[PDB]
Design a binder for this molecule. Structure first.
Ligand SMILES: Nc1ncnc2c1ncn2[C@@H]1O[C@H](COP(=O)(O)OP(=O)(O)OP(=O)(O)O)[C@@H](O)[C@H]1O
Ligand SMILES: Cc1cn([C@H]2C[C@H](O)[C@@H](COP(=O)(O)OP(=O)(O)OP(=O)(O)O)O2)c(=O)[nH]c1=O
Ligand SMILES: Cc1cn([C@H]2C[C@H](O)[C@@H](COP(=O)(O)OP(=O)(O)OP(=O)(O)O)O2)c(=O)[nH]c1=O
Ligand SMILES: [Mg+2]
Ligand SMILES: [Mg+2]
Ligand SMILES: [Mn+2]
Ligand SMILES: [Mn+2]
Ligand SMILES: [Mn+2]
Ligand SMILES: [Mn+2]
Lengths: 287, 683, 287, 683
């Protein structure tokens, strides 16, 4: 009942980072403190890693196991967006704002950062555990994918949105909003596929799947807290970002058909502000 | 966020269900009181300010020295006597961010609006203090607006050329192509838009010195021109702008159009070069009958007949070319070509369309030459003669290259003051002065044609603003009636001023004797037809103004026959892009694009309601995209019957309009006498 | 040396089925004979069936085994074009020209057809034989992929190009030309990835891989001749189609860095009308 | 497959473990008998052939009109009397595919080797029958090979210029840049390669008319020039090739070098323009000491001192520029720049390296100007003066451009005939005639410099071939001894011929009196040092030939002081690529790249063994990539000490070599007096 409308929405949202000129951010970037620039680079690098694996591994593997040519076409399109559009856009931003050495250093930093490695290990592990014709392993990977789309990106998205909302780094911010617009529909779509599998189960099996989903969310959440503190303490925003990731965790659960898990909190209002051809006939020559 | 920006942004905050249009007066008042009065360099008196400006290489002392300081003081007092106030924030913002003279560090404002107007008036008067005061009254009343080049640069030592529109003919030779590249770079360096005619260049696959398949066609020359315009970027603040025009019957027409396709290969794409196509009536006739058409190799025609293909009448020579074996041609589908043009205009808005027969059936100077192409804005339509640039140490055969300095009447202010005649004559005098003071040192044909033709372009602006502020729909018959009467009067008084100037100076433009002005064929419709308003509502708008009759046109015809005409061309309606904000007027004679114009400057966004926009006249400020393009074509054709040059005519298309709708609009424009079509803008 | 350049060319060639209006083809379709309509339907179904294998298996399997983030992104983009753009385009052409029952019957026939099946299963067999971390098996699959993209499609493309060059079925011919333009670049790109593997091999292993490629080409070519006679004898075109197959076989070989196998032939003019840094050590300055 | 091609391919088929070299003679004989004789047009007599060629617009009738038909017949008999036979298939194939005159349809052969030789000799003799016979004997003996332009075009009506190498100075102005583009297009239209000096252009971010940051730098001009060369690509028969040179101290050096990075953006990347770097000894000294270096903005230096940066002595003015606050400069790392040059040459072979102080420490015409850049082949090193091209209707200040017509001595044939003196003098006469008959009417500086300086380039080829066929290793000290003696003799006889021409014509080259020839400083090393062979084996090679001694050099010095010199420059060893096959010789003085050359012509692969290659001389035909580049540098430096211009020096690198090895080779070449390095070829 939904794939065709998602197909149409995905293809109509198609974009390339080159559509957005980035030289306009040069001055507002120059004006940020060293702490702010450091957090910003690292945040986008963490996002780049997530999209790299979502494009290389997550979306293609889910596409392989989901039945139906139209469902596969949507998932293939989403995969392309992840690595050919999203992951690449971050390099466009980096190449504009930062010198090569700072770019090299931040990519080295992703490799050695323990929270980023842990979250990649956990998510990719679940993708690679999918067994052919085994719907339960597929469900588990789809939960992981929804958590990546609708929860894990948000510790990263906070900062570009926070600046966009203050009228700073608005070209980079425009790119990020386009990425976010895509991930929102990706999270909903994968969520609907996960619910399909969940709804086939006995009540006993469903109870276990909810346990899996909640245990996984909590494990990812605890790691994300440490990641958030590590990045944001130097810019004074860790508590604010934490509220934002809890907000988005609830959205991820909802995408999976589950009740919200965290209590509602006031999000920084700045971040909220951050959000044919037809032929000519003979009569056409007479009036 | 500055206070004036906060007040301006309150425009869109609807109160009581209606926009708070009164916030713009508050916005402009706060803008002035908090930014402009603070950041204005202070001088004790006019003498000290003028001495500082001249000493610091701001004002040229040549034009100021023609007046005794008492005269300059009187002119400046005349400018300030009006107590002119900008009615909206956007007008003052535009003036003080684009045209107001600022210190070399761009931190302080040396010129107010009155100072700029007084300097321009002194430059125009050329020593005439009373003439300078008349110019000051004309510009401070905002009845006449000099073009952006003249207005910004007049009286400035650093100033660039006061003329900004250039048309170059390119001859079919390497020497001529190199000279064209050089002249294009030289003119772009001056900041003027340069338009080139590529119809004389031989098509791709033609022989060079009995060596076949050697020529690269017009696309290689276009790549050269694109690189030249990219290099001469005018400091980069305004990227170099050039237009290339090609006849539709040129062999390279398909490749010429393919340069603007997004799918085109990067080695063929021409990023910085606008393209216009010249369409003779023969092509439209071929497409209408669905007959197979041919595109000709220009050099074969030139060899067979000793004249260029674009120098001949295609309506008379097409059959001879087709039947001549020595002429090389390839078959095309005229309807397929029209559909391709519509598709390209929808995708990118290109190419500009020039209807050659529409232009040349009313052209007064066909004896000098037919109009073969247009300019970068598509409204300049003048006779041109190609130059023969020979080898080094060989004398060049300098032809005629087209150029005109622009000015715009403010229709609303001209009608409110009932000063059509006086405003038109003063604008003609100022344009003539600008033309006489121009001397291009690296464009021999441009300079020769400026000396010989004395072509000027007097446009108009605020047609839609005036109509909306008077309860008249743009598409309504009354709007066309007013446009007909007003532009007939403008043409009458510009012709009268040109004849009077010819009588006073004792000289006409070169080759005036063979023009339709000299033979009287120009005045046939004016002496035979009455152009007074046919509606009482329109006739009342002209109350207090004398509308010329057939007897008046007969008298003017006799006067011209006696004394001739000083200008080969007088009237052209240019887009008038950024100077319309200063005048608080709608752009040119086009309908407004938006009722409220939302723009982002710096990191703060600003809102510009259309001048005079209010609840009472909200419905009369209909947007162009919501308008019937057939009625817009009708209005432009009504105006065009009194304009000797062209009119920049943008097509405003909805995204739902197919390529057939665009083709029908172009065909109706050609049917209605439209000379050129500028842009295809899609909402 | 090449992936970013191909990335650029691929993304700038992006298109969607909806851009070409198909209904005006019915004005020439109605004037074709039964044999012409039959051949066209069968050719179209052949292309559709082969392209589906490439979208579901060929491109995604190669993307899975190739190392490099940028290569995976380009390959993902190509897989997207197969599944989201090409497959929808073929379906659109069919739905325009034939009623539902006729489409189902043609696909039933072509699905059972011996020559179509032989080539489809030969290609799919090589994709299924790729082994993790075995570059030889990957190379063999890449050869199969290049043969599909740059060679096997062309016995089919011939007919739409033949009509397109005559002014018949212009809307569907425009679509086919866009598809063909994508397959050409796909073939060139996968060819460069195969040459990279080939160049890492010993001289004996190279000779062995050359023998593999030529042997595979021979098997496919002999089946193409039979496929060609089966479809094109009824419309009298087989001789010219055979020249077009050999010409495209030579292009496929050149994509794999191999010499042409067949002598140069002219093509039907109607179809043509359709178509090591080290630093200086302060002693290098003294002698 | 052709029978001759099958015979040639049998070369590689090993028989008894040995290459079948005798199969090439059979291959050439079969090629002739089966294709050349069949496709050779038949003429009853020479008179009929000459009439057909003249009437059919194949030959220029003017030069043939200076001889009675009896003399033309005698010259043709002299050419044919030799019964010259091509020793290999590739020689005849290259001649009859590139230089042999063919009918307008390129179907039949109108000229044989003898016919082309006779026509060239008659063109050279300029009406002298005995001189024409001497030229025929020189060319048919293959002791001298005129450059490809002269050999191909001499005596042909539809011919390009006989000079094919031009060097253009570009002044820092828009007029000069546009004129440079025009001249480059005009010269490429003639088929000649154009090298442009961009060191006088101001760097990116410089002020244009007291407006800062307005300049695009040398990269924008580079894009302009690249597009100009792509457009004027010789009617598509040969893509337009141009070279741009920038001094290493120019601020745009890094941007200039980045245009050749593969990863470079297409906007900045230049595709068809070769780039060379001019490195003064100051840069090498700075890099050696690892001191921080500065790159200067040329316009600031010009304003501060009134001279261009490349017109001043960098070794002396570098500290003054660094200490001048009014001179803008950018800190750089000289060793990082050297390593960047090495890596760029490894990846692409660019840029060319010109060691400015090596060129000018021996430059004989420093009074006219220093040598600032080289040509597209990096062997032309002459004084140039920049032209000042002004606005239209103003007078241009025409300077001195660079152009020399080339010819190559066949070292093996000259040594076998013991005719160094006669061959050198005849080649000098022919090059002087080519220079005299050359007139470019669209490059005023080129024409003026050709008329004033009378520069010629007499090169040599078959050095490695001659040495290998004589059992001498290219890297051996004996090879360097032979090169020293041979090129000393060549220089001696070219100087003697130049002095004799000056005496006969009673005229020297412009500003000869200030040259080192006039003051005698040129002959210091020749009058103080002996260049006779130090090895008995090499000394035997010169048996029957007089080796000039110190007394001979003193007599020549006195003769030059009495009579002067006709040529400002005489000797330059150009790459001489295409005509090496016809001459059956190794290209230039470089070592062979491969013992047997594998080429593809159509679908047929041809095998070309190195001329004279055999089992007994296989070891001496060592490939260049296997040689020590230090020994090649030693050889080129031994040769370069007797060449007034440069030697086109290609570096042959193995893929295992790092950028450090390339840098070491460059530094050793600079140490050894090398003037230019042409290409970094990697295997
Ligand atoms: N809308 C406006 N357009 C142009 N100039 C303005 C505008 N508003 C203010 N100014 C300038 O700022 C000065 C101060 O404005 P303000 O309205 O406070 O003046 P005022 O003392 O009330 O009297 P007046 O209007 O006669 O100047 C004005 O004299 C004029 O010079
Ligand atoms: C020299 C040259 C010219 N052209 C084009 C540009 C000109 O419009 C056209 C004519 O070149 P011309 O400069 O006029 O050549 P020509 O006059 O000597 O030869 P002909 O009399 O036969 O014309 O050829 C090229 O495309 N490439 C080139 O390299
Ligand atoms: C006009 C122009 C010049 N230039 C560069 C090229 C020239 O080498 C350099 C000087 O241009 P010039 O033509 O010499 O300009 P100018 O002489 O009027 O200014 P100045 O007095 O400072 O010399 O500027 C650009 O890069 N872009 C341009 O548009
Ligand atoms: Mg010509
Ligand atoms: Mg200058
Ligand atoms: Mn993503
Ligand atoms: Mn996603
Ligand atoms: Mn496909
Ligand atoms: Mn494909």
């Amino acid at each position: 009942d939904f794939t065709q409308m998602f197909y149409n929405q995905n293809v109509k949202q198609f974009w390339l980072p080159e559509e957005i000129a980035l030289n306009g951010d040069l001055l507002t970037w120059k004006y940020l403190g060293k702490n702010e620039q450091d957090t910003y680079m690292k945040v986008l690098a963490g996002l780049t890693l997530l999209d790299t694996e979502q494009g290389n591994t997550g979306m293609p593997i889910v596409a392989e196991h989901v039945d139906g040519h139209q469902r596969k076409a949507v998932l293939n399109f989403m995969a392309m967006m992840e690595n050919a559009v999203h992951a690449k856009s971050y390099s466009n931003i980096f190449m504009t704002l930062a010198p090569t050495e700072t770019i090299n250093e931040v990519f080295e930093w992703v490799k050695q950062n323990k929270y980023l490695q842990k979250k990649a290990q956990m998510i990719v592990g679940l993708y690679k555990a999918i067994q052919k014709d085994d719907e339960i392993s597929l469900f588990k990977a789809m939960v992981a994918s929804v958590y990546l789309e609708s929860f894990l990106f948000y510790s990263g998205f906070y900062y570009p949105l926070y600046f966009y909302g203050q009228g700073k780094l608005m070209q980079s911010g425009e790119i990020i909003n386009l990425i976010l617009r895509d991930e929102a529909i990706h999270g909903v779509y994968v969520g609907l596929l996960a619910q399909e599998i969940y709804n086939k189960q006995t009540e006993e099996k469903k109870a276990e799947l909810r346990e899996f989903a909640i245990d996984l969310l909590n494990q990812l959440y605890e790691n994300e807290l440490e990641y958030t503190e590590d990045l944001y303490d130097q810019v004074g925003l860790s508590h604010d970002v934490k509220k934002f990731i809890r907000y988005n965790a609830n959205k991820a659960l909802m995408n999976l058909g589950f009740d919200p898990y965290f209590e509602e909190e006031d999000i920084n209002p700045i971040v909220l502000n951050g959000l044919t051809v037809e032929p000519l006939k003979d009569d056409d020559f007479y009036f | 966020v500055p206070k004036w920006i906060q007040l301006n942004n309150e425009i869109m905050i609807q109160k009581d269900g209606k926009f708070q249009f009164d916030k713009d007066k508050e916005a402009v008042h706060s803008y002035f009181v908090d930014y402009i009065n603070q950041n204005t360099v202070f001088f004790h008196n006019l003498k000290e300010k003028l001495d500082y400006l001249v000493e610091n290489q701001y004002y040229e002392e040549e034009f100021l020295s023609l007046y005794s300081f008492e005269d300059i003081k009187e002119v400046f007092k005349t400018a300030y006597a009006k107590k002119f106030r900008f009615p909206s924030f956007m007008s003052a913002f535009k003036f003080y961010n684009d045209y107001a003279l600022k210190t070399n560090d761009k931190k302080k404002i040396l010129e107010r609006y009155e100072d700029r107007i007084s300097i321009v008036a002194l430059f125009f008067a050329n020593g005439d203090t009373e003439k300078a005061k008349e110019y000051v009254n004309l510009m401070i009343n905002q009845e006449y607006q000099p073009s952006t080049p003249t207005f910004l640069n007049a009286g400035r030592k650093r100033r660039g050329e006061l003329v900004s529109c250039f048309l170059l003919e390119v001859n079919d030779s390497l020497n001529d192509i190199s000279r064209a590249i050089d002249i294009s770079m030289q003119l772009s360096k001056l900041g003027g838009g340069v338009s080139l005619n590529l119809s004389k260049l031989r098509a791709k696959g033609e022989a060079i010195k009995d060596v076949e398949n050697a020529t690269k066609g017009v696309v290689g020359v276009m790549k050269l021109l694109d690189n030249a315009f990219r290099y001469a970027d005018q400091m980069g603040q305004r990227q170099g702008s050039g237009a290339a025009y090609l006849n539709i019957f040129h062999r390279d027409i398909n490749d010429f159009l393919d340069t603007k396709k997004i799918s085109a290969d990067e080695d063929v794409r021409v990023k910085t070069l606008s393209i216009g196509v010249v369409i003779p009536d023969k092509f439209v006739e071929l497409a209408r009958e669905d007959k197979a058409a041919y595109v000709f190799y220009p050099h074969t025609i030139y060899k067979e007949y000793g004249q260029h293909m674009d120098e001949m009448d295609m309506n008379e020579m097409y059959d001879k070319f087709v039947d001549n074996p020595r002429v090389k041609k390839e078959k095309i589908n005229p309807r397929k070509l029209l559909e391709k043009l519509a598709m390209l205009r929808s995708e990118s808005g290109y190419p500009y369309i020039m209807f050659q027969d529409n232009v040349n059936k009313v052209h007064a100077n066909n004896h000098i030459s037919k109009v073969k192409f247009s300019n970068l804005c598509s409204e300049v339509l003048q006779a041109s003669q190609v130059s023969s640039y020979t080898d080094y140490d060989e004398e060049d055969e300098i032809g005629l290259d087209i150029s005109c300095n622009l000015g715009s009447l403010n229709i609303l202010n001209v009608m409110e003051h009932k000063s059509i005649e006086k405003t038109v004559k003063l604008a003609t005098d100022s344009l003539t002065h600008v033309s006489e003071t121009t001397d291009i040192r690296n464009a021999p044909a441009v300079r020769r044609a400026n000396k010989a033709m004395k072509s000027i372009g007097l446009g108009a602006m605020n047609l839609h603003g005036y109509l909306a502020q008077n309860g008249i729909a743009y598409e309504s018959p009354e709007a066309r009636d007013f446009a007909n009467t007003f532009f007939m009067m403008v043409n009458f008084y510009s012709i009268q001023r040109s004849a009077e100037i010819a009588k006073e100076k004792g000289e006409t433009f070169d080759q005036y004797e063979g023009s339709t002005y000299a033979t009287g064929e120009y005045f046939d419709k004016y002496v035979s037809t009455d152009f007074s308003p046919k509606y009482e509502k329109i006739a009342n708008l002209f109350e207090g103004m004398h509308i010329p009759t057939t007897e008046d046109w007969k008298k003017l015809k006799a006067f011209v026959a006696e004394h001739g005409m000083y200008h080969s061309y007088r009237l052209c309606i240019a887009p008038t892009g950024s100077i319309s904000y200063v005048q608080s007027s709608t752009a040119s004679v086009m309908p407004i694009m938006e009722r409220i114009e939302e723009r982002t400057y710096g990191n703060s966004k600003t809102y510009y309601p259309m001048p005079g926009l209010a609840s009472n006249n909200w419905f009369f400020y209909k947007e162009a995209y919501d308008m019937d393009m057939f009625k817009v074509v009708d209005m432009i054709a009504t105006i065009q019957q009194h304009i000797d040059q062209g009119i920049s005519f943008t097509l405003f298309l909805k995204d739902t309009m197919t390529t057939r709708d665009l083709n029908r609009i172009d065909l109706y424009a050609h049917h209605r006498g439209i000379k050129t079509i500028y842009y295809a803008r899609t909402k």
